[PDB]
């Protein structure tokens, strides 16, 4: 049978994983890095590509 | 994301062996105990066994009904949990779920159906359920294995149709029945791929 | 000294409105660390089980926040603030004080609330194509009733009938049932009906050949 | 002296409070209710107040 | 059988750069539930203590995420990914396996890294206005050194001196110290200097009347 | 937001009593054990005692140095924890912190200074620390209670100044010294409000 410590390990793990997922979600909403995937342009002197 | 991908079941004869696998992805498999739980068709969920993580000794426990026939193991390098099933019996027929956790079952595999039977492939027999005085149907009897599909009028009639779950008879063959309601031009179309059997039958008094 | 939980057998629900599932244990689940060792699971039809609530009142990441749990000691409740139609299935409260849990138990069958409806019963006799074989199948159908729990008895009997039930209909929210009495053509000729019961019926109902 | 359960109670409490604060933060960033505190207008026909 | 922790006595740090504080316990802090019962606290100068990390590696809500902890068993580390100047103070690692904790211990004194500097020593004699009173105060000053730890001895002695130290200067990042030898005008006339030590000095240093 | 607001300390004579309070806001006070921790001037943090929540029996524990003189109590209706200190001794002089938690001290009050002394209010004496051959200062001796402030040239000179923490002498009176460095017009201005004493003194050989 599972001891009390073995069960606590699983519950506390779930609580810290819940926290980790919430914190990741905060950081995405606030400061997720944004890729510049490409560029295009029309500029003077025929500068029509980057 | 967390995934538990199950494979390795299917049809097996009594006395024979099968090994089910659960392949994990998206978490550290080696940190979790892993459990097996099974569900006989139309019944409740029964605990089969579980294996502890290496952090707690890597040992197993088993339900008394499978002890000495089933064994659980794990491969932490491939992130796989296994259920080795020997000396299989008809009452072992079930969907087998793998789940993460030994006490808290916080993520579950999609399940693997294991059917233990000595039956041979057999096309069904169709028989009519006709009225007399607003309800008729077909009886699709004595086939193996599942499934068998049933439409009415090549899928033109759907309203009022009820196709019932198959039942397993004492003979080892399945049987279902489809019905539909209409008062006061009625065919059921039955299809059993495993034996390459198709059948249409008209219902009237 | 075995620790069991019990919850209601069935619970009709109405989308848009709240629902509550009660749970009682044979023994306090309150641990010295302050938590109740009681978890809630849900099995939707044709899906695998899923965790909802752990240690009485903690909602796992990704579970919709319309689910909550409360209670302490021996009495617990799962609350859905506003039911959705996708919430039907079997709910289980599972104690974790004593392990292993050998079974999840019968759980609470949640389905769509509707007005009671009685089974429209029908009896069908064995076909002649089948009697030519050597066996006789006679069917008794209980169509569109609510809630589940329609019973059938035969009188040509025991140990020679099998029954089957549909899932709750997506349209009218009712169930249907088929029973199938099986005897040999011999034992069939040697006689010359099915008795239904159901809460939506005033009194039992029979249908004979 | 404090038992193991008494200490676990305090640690698990902190983990669930951390989670609760993170979840509140998510809900603020995503769906915090916004008060309309006042209004003003110039509309046809001399409609110069709400 | 008493459970103690030890961390380094001092730790100069550089803002912009990482810092690590090690911790060793006399006994494993690993519990059967999988966690190490080790918490980290910080006391900034003139402020009250504050929690940073609990159970070895969990960061409490509101603590800056440049702080993390790791380790297991008897060996633990607090890591600051990039130190800020506001992070100076005393860091404490505290075991929670055995309670109560009677003391927080000496902790790790974190201050601003700079190049070693030796104390510019000065001796001042008792004033005449004070000698008219009946007591004699002679001061020995150790100005602008680094790190802390400048020692002073007197030879007119024991049990008649008191010392004081400033906080790390906001500009040059050094410390200063004052010792004050106190004897009666009697015992003072009855004789007719202070010996410093410090790592930034080649050898001890004396200053006499 | 969570707050722990401390009050009730100050100056007290040996043998007498004081009650410190910690008034909590922004959390459910009644769910937490509450602890007292103290810090003698320039020393480490010493655990004084704690009280459990009602959920764990409401009982207290105390350091052996205060047992039988100090008692902790709580009022869950007002959300206050108290430290009752009787038979106070000079070595009880300290900043007293209240903190939430009995094992994990996750939120701390701002601290309350308690000074145990039989000393009378006394203005300081200032004496010069003059050079001979780049550093001079003043010695501010024999005052009570703290604090005493020190500027140089009415706050015109700040560079090179170091005003030292007061030290408590065996007599029960405090003394600090201020110094400043300049080579080759120098007054220290000393202010002791509690006795309404102000003093300026010129430093030269």
What does this entry look like structurally?
This is part of a larger assembly, with two copies of chain A (50 residues), two copies of chain B (205 residues) and two copies of chain C (209 residues). With 50 residues, chain A is mainly α. Chain A contains one helix and no strands. Chain A has one helix at residues 4-31. Chain A starts with a helix and ends in a 19-residue tail after the last helix. Chain B has 205 residues and is mostly beta strands. Chain B folds into two domains: 1-118, no CATH class; 119-205, Immunoglobulin-like (Sandwich), CATH 2.60.40.10. Chain B has strands at 3-7, 10-12, 18-25, 34-39, 45-51, 60-62, 70-75, 80-85, 94-100, 107-108, 112-116, 125-129, 135-143, 149-152, 162-163, 167-168, 174-181, 187-192, 197-202. In chain B, the strands form four sheets. In chain B, strands 2, 4, 5, 6, 9, 10 and 11 form a seven-stranded mixed sheet that branches. In chain B, strands 12, 13, 15, 16 and 17 form a five-stranded antiparallel sheet that branches. In chain B, strands 1-3-8-7 form a four-stranded antiparallel sheet, with no helix packed on it. In chain B, a hairpin with a 6-residue loop joins β9 and β10. Chain C is mainly β. Chain C has two domains: 1-113, Immunoglobulin-like (Sandwich), CATH 2.60.40.10; 114-209, Immunoglobulin-like, CATH 2.60.40.10. In chain C, 4% of the residues lie in helices and 44% in strands. Chain C has a six-stranded mixed sheet with strand order 2-10-9-4-5-6, with no helix packed on it. A four-stranded antiparallel sheet of chain C has the order 1-3-8-7, with no helix packed on it. A four-stranded antiparallel sheet of chain C has the order 11-12-15-14. In chain C, a hairpin with a 3-residue loop joins β5 (50-54) and β6 (58-59). The longest helix of chain C has 5 residues, at 185-189. Chains A, D: This is Erythronolide synthase EryA2.
Percent range of helical residues of chain A? 55-70%
Rg of chain A is 24 Å
Shape of chain A: rod-shaped
Q: Class of the largest domain in chain C in CATH?
A: Mainly Beta
The structural class of chain A is mainly alpha
**Coarse structural class of chain C:** mainly beta
Q: Helical segment tally of chain A?
A: 1
Using the alpha-carbon principal axes, give the shape of chain C.
elongated
From the alpha carbons, calculate the radius of gyration of chain C and give it in angstroms. 22 Å
Number of beta strands of chain C: 17
Share of β-strand residues of chain A:
under 5%
Give the strand tally of chain A: 0
Most strands sheet of chain A: none
Largest contact between chains? B-C, 43 and 41 residues
Order of helices and strands of chain A: H
PDB class: transferase/immune system
Keywords: PKS, TRANSFERASE-immune system complex
Entry title: Crystal structure of [KS3][AT3] didomain from module 3 of 6-deoxyerthronolide B synthase in complex with antibody fragment (Fab)
Chains A, D: 6-deoxyerythronolide-B synthase EryA2, modules 3 and 4
């Amino acid at each position: 049978m599972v001891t009390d410590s073995e069960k606590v390990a699983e519950y506390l793990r779930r609580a810290t994983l819940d926290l980790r997922a919430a914190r990741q979600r905060i950081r995405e909403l606030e400061s997720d890095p944004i890729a510049i995937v490409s560029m295009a342009c029309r500029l003077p002197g025929g500068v029509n590509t980057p | 994301e967390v995934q538990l991908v199950q494979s390795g079941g299917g049809l097996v004869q009594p006395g024979r062996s099968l090994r089910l696998s659960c392949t994990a992805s998206g978490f550290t498999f080696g940190d979790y105990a892993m459990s097996w739980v099974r569900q006989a068709p139309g019944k409740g969920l029964e605990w089969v066994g579980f294996i502890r993580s290496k952090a707690y000794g890597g040992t197993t426990e088993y339900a008394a009904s499978v002890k000495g026939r089933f064994t659980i193991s794990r491969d932490d390098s491939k992130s796989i949990a296994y259920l080795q099933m020997n000396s299989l019996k008809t009452e072992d027929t079930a969907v087998y779920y793998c789940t993460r956790g030994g006490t808290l079952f916080d993520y579950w595999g999609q399940g693997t159906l294991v059917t233990v039977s000595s039956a041979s492939t057999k096309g069904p027999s169709v028989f009519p359920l006709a009225p007399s005085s607003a309800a008729l149907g077909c009886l699709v009897k004595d086939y193996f294995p599942e499934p068998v599909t049933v439409s009415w009028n090549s899928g033109a009639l759907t309203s009022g149709v009820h196709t019932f779950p198959a039942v397993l008879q004492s003979s080892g063959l399945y049987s279902l029945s489809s019905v539909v309601t209409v008062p006061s031009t009625y065919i059921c179309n039955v299809n059993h791929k495993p034996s390459n059997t198709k059948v249409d039958k008209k219902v009237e008094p | 000294d075995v620790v069991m939980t019990q919850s209601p057998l069935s619970l009709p629900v109405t989308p848009g409105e709240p629902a509550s599932i009660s749970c009682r244990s044979s023994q306090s689940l309150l641990h010295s660390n302050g938590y109740n060792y009681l978890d809630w699971y849900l099995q939707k039809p044709g899906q695998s089980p899923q965790l909802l609530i752990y240690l009485g009142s903690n909602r796992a990441s990704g579970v919709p926040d319309r689910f909550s749990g409360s209670g302490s000691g021996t009495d617990f409740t799962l609350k859905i603030s506003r039911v959705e139609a996708e919430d039907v299935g079997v709910y289980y409260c599972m104690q974790s004080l004593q392990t292993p849990r050998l079974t999840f138990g019968p759980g609470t069958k949640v389905d769509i609330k509707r007005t009671v409806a009685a089974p429209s019963v029908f009896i069908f006799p064995p076909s002649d194509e089948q009697l030519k074989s050597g066996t006789a199948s006679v069917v008794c159908l209980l169509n569109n009733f609510y809630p589940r729990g329609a019973k059938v008895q035969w009188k040509v009997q025991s140990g020679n009938s099998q029954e089957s039930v549909t899932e709750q209909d997506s349209k009218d929210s009712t169930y249907s049932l088929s029973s199938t009495l099986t005897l040999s053509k011999a034992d069939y000729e040697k006689h010359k009906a099915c008795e239904v019961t159901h809460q939506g019926l005033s009194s039992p109902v029979t249908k004979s050949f």
